[PDB]
């Protein structure tokens, strides 16, 4: 069958991937006792947008649920799926002849049917008539709350939809749940995005020089991923010095200084499939003793979490595991003193890692389904920032991204709190003010017995220093 | 005073640039008989947006009028200008403490005042109180129609604005007219964006190889402009012999393989600190012009240079478009593609078959800049000319693109061959050879001076210059 491809060495993605997703969605809806026979899923694709009142185009990127179901790159489409039969119909714009002059050839409906391997193709201005002739019981539209943005998914609408019975509650939790579990075809794409991104991160480590601007590295990274991978930046983090303390840190215009710890967090996507990797490393290519200690603490928690991950593991337990390891290591360094058990009970870990350990990844970098009905957010420091509190199951894709930061306002808050202040050694901590931070982010897939690591970048102090010194890769 | 700067070799842009724009706007409004004493200009800046219902951020880019007046890069601001005194007040978001953790340092209001060289800074949630205490007569807000998009400009609004008298008609044409005429400080930025982009175009010509994907050149171009210039792609064109055909939108990767014998047409735009550039280079994929390629290319070079040589204050822009048409038709006849009277070809609008777009457009903070069709200036309802983005007379301070081209577009050629009024001009036996040629476009950015133009762009343009550039010759080499 047909595939998406940007030539050269880029990945061929079979359109069969999206056919399988439609099948899986129907199979799930059929088991839902509230779903009526004769229901049709109706999804509306994204449209081209312009900046404010200008004719300046914003780069078009397909809406994620619609992409998941159909893999369609063109703006202005709809897609429907007959739940009982699984039959797919794509609706495309009826374009005018002037489109031939400055946009391009006007493809036939046949062309799109073959391109996307759907059962039928019709024009958008005919959607109400086509759906009417199919005599559906109910139209299932998409509406629900994204638990990272807090935004409400926008329901499909078309001229004449008011004449149909519409249900906007059933679909969202079901299609979200399908997205949580990646198919083998989906995993192939995520392996690819991780491969390209990993290569780009290596090139960044090889290229960094004291005196460069952060955005020079962003530029190189993006150039590698686009020219070699057919990939683009996903969500709009190259922090050197105390900017590495800033989690989501426009062009990053800080000059990389000698002695800085760089924290390079980029994401990217191929055909709307994401990757999210973070590398930390000394700007000048040589870890100081302090940098090595902080860095190896995060390497330890990173590897402890990956090693412990398997089906049945509760994700908040992994977050707490990283906290405990960080506190142990900060104590070994002399930054902390006292009982680590007591430190954990006082939530001291969150002073140094205020964000969640990691998140679902897929078509969105912060992928859907972290907090389905019945799964609650934990109202404690650190944990409340987790983007899921679910138990792990095979097929889930997660980032594992512990970090340690020295953030003045969190440190000062702890120092003012008698329940936490006694753990902190001001005279040692003073040395780490302005250190910035370290974050190590891997992408992994949960397997039947553990995980599969998708990411492949230098991680040990030795590996990183060798990479940055320009040593041939084969060098040990 | 303070400046915007991205370090290294990038341009330092004084915030005085924006102060001058505010002063110029106030000076214009003070001369406007309908403007009430005590009026204040109220502009609302852009806000951060996310992809659909996700938390995936869209790259923030400031709204153009707001940028023109204030140069503010932060989302969620407002800006006001007292017309009678010129006093400026920037309103910035009151950020929560968690911002220190996730975004960066929470800057003071004094920090922003110093950064932007405005007279006062307040928090956005205090705008109604602050304006009430200043007792303005009228709030002048922004509403009007962009004549390229057809969209209506979004008026500023804030909770409590209903308690003020608001006029939304006066401001738009006046601030548009200010933007049409670039200051000396604005021209320095446009010279810079043209310099970086010109350098990037040279690198593309130097790097291109048969067998590459078009998007590989786009990537290289964008990397040069960003890493060396601090610039970003502006509006979402690397055509050989594909992005819209294969994926449905220009922003998609152009994934056509560049073939031996292809004519490349490389049209990119970009911006530095929201100031645009828009340049197009055409060149043979394999670095050697064929006779046919030389002939078509030199035809467009002739019209480019004829228009640039003719441009000066008082010239009617549509006359320049017609001049380019006539030259294209003359040269296509000299090639044997056309035959007969060029006077007759023009009367039959044959030029639009080969150049269906406008000769060029205003450029500034937007690539297709504002003010091309103010009230009283009409769009010409003829092929080609109806696509012009302005029908104004040229005056000093305007910045325009000059981008004639010749294309071989099957459905336009076929229409002409089926039209008895046009068909007899075309020689099918020669034209058939140019089916699939693609096209040539040569786009320069220029400033209208007191007596002519200043060319902003600096790329190889003659056949010899282009072949030398593609052969890896130093810039300073002149063949
Ligand atoms: O947003 C998140 O959850 C992670 C934390 C560090 C940056 N990205
Ligand atoms: O849109 C315009 O006016 C010009 C014509 C060719 C591409 N850009
Ligand atoms: Mn992440
Ligand atoms: Mn242009
Ligand atoms: Na991350
Ligand atoms: Na152009």
UniProtKB/Swiss-Prot annotation, chain A:
The keyword Acyltransferase is assigned to this record: no
A single BP term in Gene Ontology: amino acid metabolic process
Organism domain of life: Eukaryota
EC number(s) on file: 3.4.13.9
Amino acids binding Mn(2+) 2: 276, 359, 401, 441
Cofactor(s) required, per the database record: Mn(2+)
Phosphoserine: modified positions: 162
Bridged cysteine pairs (disulfide): none
Cofactor annotation comment: Binds 2 manganese ions per subunit.
InterPro entries in the cross-refs: Aminopep_P_N (IPR007865), Creatin/AminoP/Spt16_N (IPR029149), Creatinase/aminopeptidase-like (IPR036005), Pept_M24 (IPR000994), Peptidase_M24B_aminopep-P_CS (IPR001131), X-Pro_dipept-like (IPR052433)
Regulation: Specifically inhibited by the pseudodipeptide CQ31. Inhibition by CQ31 indirectly activates the CARD8 inflammasome: dipeptide accumulation following PEPD inactivation weaky inhibit dipeptidyl peptidases DDP8 and DPP9, relieving DPP8- and/or DPP9-mediated inhibition of CARD8.
Catalytic activity: Xaa-L-Pro dipeptide + H2O = an L-alpha-amino acid + L-proline
Residues annotated to bind Mn(2+) 1: 265, 276, 441
Keywords: Acetylation, Collagen degradation, Dipeptidase, Disease variant, Hydrolase, Manganese, Metal-binding, Metalloprotease, Phosphoprotein, Protease
UniProt disease link: Prolidase deficiency: A multisystem disorder associated with massive iminodipeptiduria and lack of or reduced prolidase activity in erythrocytes, leukocytes, or cultured fibroblasts. Clinical features include skin ulcers, developmental delay, recurrent infections, and a characteristic facies.
Protein family according to the UniProt entry: Belongs to the peptidase M24B family. Eukaryotic-type prolidase subfamily.
Subunit-structure text: Homodimer.
Protein name: Xaa-Pro dipeptidase
Lineage: Eukaryota, Metazoa, Chordata, Craniata, Vertebrata
